[PDB]
Structure 1
Amino acid sequence: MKNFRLSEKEVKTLAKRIPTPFLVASLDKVEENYQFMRRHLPRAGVFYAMKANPTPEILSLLAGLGSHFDVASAGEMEILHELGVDGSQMIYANPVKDARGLKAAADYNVRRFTFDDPSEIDKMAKAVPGADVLVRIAVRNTKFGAPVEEALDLLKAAQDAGLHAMGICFHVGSQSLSTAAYEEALLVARRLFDEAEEMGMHLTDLDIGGGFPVPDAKGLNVDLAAMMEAINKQIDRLFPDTAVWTEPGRYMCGTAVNLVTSVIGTKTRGEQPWYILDEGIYGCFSGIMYDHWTYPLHCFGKGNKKPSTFGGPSCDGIDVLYRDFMAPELKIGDKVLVTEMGSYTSVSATRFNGFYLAPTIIFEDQPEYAARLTEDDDVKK
């Protein structure tokens, strides 16, 4: 249940060697998150929604743990391919596919697809003649998902075009707090499954999507073990027959990555001090824009705190990260730490203003980790 968190001392030593900004990712935490899911939701096979974090070391580890991968483009398939993951470990789960992506699915023998529209059926059919498809249905909690009444018709239309109608999928939405939606959506899919059998169509797989929460600036309301055991139980209650899958994205790596950034300018105009950092809204803090997210920031200061503004290194007036944030006095060259940074962060970073992408350093390859290990082998036994 710990979030991966560098101590102040670890930030000092790392920053002596590696110029800021940089990200630090713990493979151990990614392993722990995966195993925790497998323990509390044993009925659900895992399609890592790699769109959240595609770091190759992270992908190699999950592949090694037996995870499967949800891929949304040619590029996601391509990077998996260079790590020796085969198309049989993938689902092309973008409901609307481009030419490049259909080619790649064909070339790497990807054989599972999701879809939510009639227009999609011929693209898939031509590209991958015999192919398992799941229909995506729109559940409650716009752009994606077929209305629940179209669902059986879309699967039948898919069989008439020579594709194998394998099942149903859905996604409750990202950062879900309550299990209700998961259980509502499981019922909605239950109805459809019955209606299908009697219709002379036998559906074998259910994909319940992602949405498992991660802690943000205010932390986490939910207990995840319960949440997962609950939904696991109501899977058992409803789908004894059926092969069920989940597509975690945010959950897998969100609590496994920290950002380390230096203060590079101060603006003590008053009333409120502005601290300018070396990572900004055009880099890792892009999730403020695209993910409506608020990240936990840690300032390492002795003095009393005061309302402070943080901004990014760019020349754009939009590059403001925090306002009215209670912070001690910082000076140029101080490090701040941002935790819970592994998801929908570096995947939307840019080279706006010519800045370099912040690199991801694998913590387990560093002496700070060796130091944690020697500290742990002494105290625990």
Structure 2
Amino acid sequence: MKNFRLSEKEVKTLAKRIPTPFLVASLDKVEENYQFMRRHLPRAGVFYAMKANPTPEILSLLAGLGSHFDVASAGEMEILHELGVDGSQMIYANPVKDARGLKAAADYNVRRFTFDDPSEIDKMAKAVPGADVLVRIAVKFGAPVEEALDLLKAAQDAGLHAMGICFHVGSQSLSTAAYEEALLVARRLFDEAEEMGMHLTDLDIGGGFPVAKGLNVDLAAMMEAINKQIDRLFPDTAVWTEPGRYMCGTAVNLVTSVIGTKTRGEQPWYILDEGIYGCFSGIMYDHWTYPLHCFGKGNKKPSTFGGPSCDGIDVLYRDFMAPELKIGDKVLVTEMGSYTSVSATRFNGFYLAPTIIFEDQPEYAARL
């Protein structure tokens, strides 16, 4: 498992014929990440958290491979529908659902819906009578385990089908022991519910998986421990996972050029043609950090990179060791797949940087 990276020569040839900034996504890498999870965690169907990356080619690839989808809004389920994706392969997993979104959900025939609060029941019962609902469980957001069953019975009472439960394990706190303890709590709640008159049939595990193999744990071995725990505890139940960052994050790169240089201070400044109102919006909204590769040879000094807009805050990196760069030189930013261009804007009238598909280019064929 390698992260998707473009070589220096690939960045130059691509930039010759696509004007910067642009993103480059690798469908091959997305597939690899999909097949990895399937190989090591076979018992979880995949609900793709498309909020992370909603690019149509990535989305089509995923429907091709069998992925279901995790929809947050009417506009998400609209994009999917034009690609031929049915609402039976959608779960509406926004906790608080818009009216416009519940309408969409009825029209498209979305099967599964999730909730943590009893104010949410009152409105799904009117909008989508008899819909299959899962409760989100905190083991902020989520619902106390001890209120989980009362919440499904309230749902069942208003004419919704109590179908099951989701938790989310945080990446920071991610461990095999953690998933194993949540599955135990889930198993108890199933058994308890059954004696309560409800047959729960579906269990949604969340995402919160990381990566590329240059990172902390042995994830293949971890998914196999979780998978073995699903097979012993939930051999008849439909199990799901909803990866988002996991699917895409290391599957996209940004190519962007130096459009100005400021040489006045001790520190050189370099203005790029993408910034915090475009793809680097991740910095503000995801609190994330993107590896930056400048390509000159020569001596390095501490250097600031700025974005292209009239705002003070359009600064991406400071005291970053980089060589001497000219205008028109190209830099490359990896880990640009998730929660980046989702947050981009046309602030200052600027265009959204397009996403180019790597497999539809000579450079991809050239890898041989």
1:274-328 per-residue CA deviation (whole Å, 9 max, x = no partner) reads 2211111111111111111001111112112222211111111111111221211
Aligned 8 A contact 1:138 1:148 in 2: yes
Q: Distance in 1 between matches of 2:352 and 2:172?
A: 26
Aligned 8 A contact 1:287 1:293 in 2: yes
Report what 2:22 is aligned to: 22
Aligned 8 A contact 2:2 2:213 in 1: no
Look up the SS of the partner of 1:150 in the other structure: helix
Aligned 8 A contact 1:52 1:343 in 2: yes
Q: Distance in 2 between matches of 1:148 and 1:212?
A: 23
Change (3 A) 1:258 1:176: farther
Q: Distance in 2 between matches of 1:175 and 1:325?
A: 26
Q: Distance in 2 between matches of 1:331 and 1:179?
A: 49
Residue 173 (structure 1) shift: 3.0
Aligned 8 A contact 1:170 1:209 in 2: yes
- Residue among 153, 164, 171 paired with 1:156: 153
Aligned 8 A contact 1:175 1:213 in 2: no
Aligned 8 A contact 1:177 1:221 in 2: no
Residue 88 (structure 1) shift: 0.5
Residue 177 (structure 1) shift: 4.7
Aligned 8 A contact 2:106 2:128 in 1: yes
Aligned 8 A contact 1:136 1:145 in 2: yes
Aligned 8 A contact 1:49 1:248 in 2: yes
Aligned 8 A contact 1:87 1:109 in 2: yes
Look up the SS of the partner of 2:192 in the other structure: helix
**1:250 equivalenced with 2:245 (yes/no):** yes
Look up the SS of the partner of 2:367 in the other structure: helix
Residue 220 (structure 1) shift: 2.2
Residue 180 (structure 1) shift: 3.6
Residue 176 (structure 1) shift: 5.7
Residue 47 (structure 1) shift: 0.5
**1:182 equivalenced with 2:142 (yes/no):** no
1:94-146 per-residue CA deviation (whole Å, 9 max, x = no partner) reads 1111111111110011121001111111211111112110001113xxx4211
Report what 1:58 is aligned to: 58
Report % sequence identity: 100
Aligned 8 A contact 2:298 2:323 in 1: yes
Change (3 A) 1:368 1:175: farther
Change (3 A) 1:102 1:225: same
Look up the SS of the partner of 1:5 in the other structure: coil
With the length of structure 2 as denominator, give the TM-score of the two structures: 0.96
1:193-245 per-residue CA deviation (whole Å, 9 max, x = no partner) reads 2221222222111101111113xx99622332122222212222322232110
Change (3 A) 1:48 1:176: farther
RMSD of aligned C-alpha atoms? 1.7
Instruction: Between 96-105 and 269-278, report the one with greater CA deviation.
Output: 269-278
Q: Distance in 2 between matches of 1:218 and 1:132?
A: 37
Residue 65 (structure 1) shift: 0.6
Q: Distance in 2 between matches of 1:270 and 1:221?
A: 39
1:131-188 per-residue CA deviation (whole Å, 9 max, x = no partner) reads 110001113xxx4211111110000001111111000001123566533432332222
Residue 27 (structure 1) shift: 0.8
Q: Distance in 2 between matches of 1:177 and 1:170?
A: 13
Q: Distance in 2 between matches of 1:181 and 1:288?
A: 29
Residue 270 (structure 1) shift: 2.9
Change (3 A) 1:68 1:176: farther
Change (3 A) 1:170 1:146: same
Q: Distance in 2 between matches of 1:218 and 1:236?
A: 26
Aligned 8 A contact 1:134 1:169 in 2: yes
Matched residues, number: 368
Q: Distance in 1 between matches of 2:60 and 2:172?
A: 25
Aligned 8 A contact 1:177 1:213 in 2: no
Q: Distance in 1 between matches of 2:171 and 2:340?
A: 15
Look up the SS of the partner of 2:246 in the other structure: helix
Aligned 8 A contact 1:266 1:274 in 2: yes
Instruction: Between 362-371 and 222-231, report the one with greater CA deviation.
Output: 222-231
Change (3 A) 1:18 1:37: same
Deviation >4 Å, runs of 4+: 174-177
1:236-281 per-residue CA deviation (whole Å, 9 max, x = no partner) reads 2322232110000001111111100101111222322222111111
Look up the SS of the partner of 1:264 in the other structure: strand
With the length of structure 1 as denominator, give the TM-score of the two structures: 0.93
Aligned 8 A contact 2:89 2:111 in 1: no
Residue 41 (structure 1) shift: 0.5
Q: Distance in 2 between matches of 1:229 and 1:133?
A: 28
Instruction: Between 66-75 and 313-322, report the one with greater CA deviation.
Output: 313-322
Gaps of 5+ in 2: none
Aligned 8 A contact 1:254 1:343 in 2: yes
Instruction: Between 95-104 and 177-186, report the one with greater CA deviation.
Output: 177-186
Aligned 8 A contact 1:300 1:336 in 2: yes
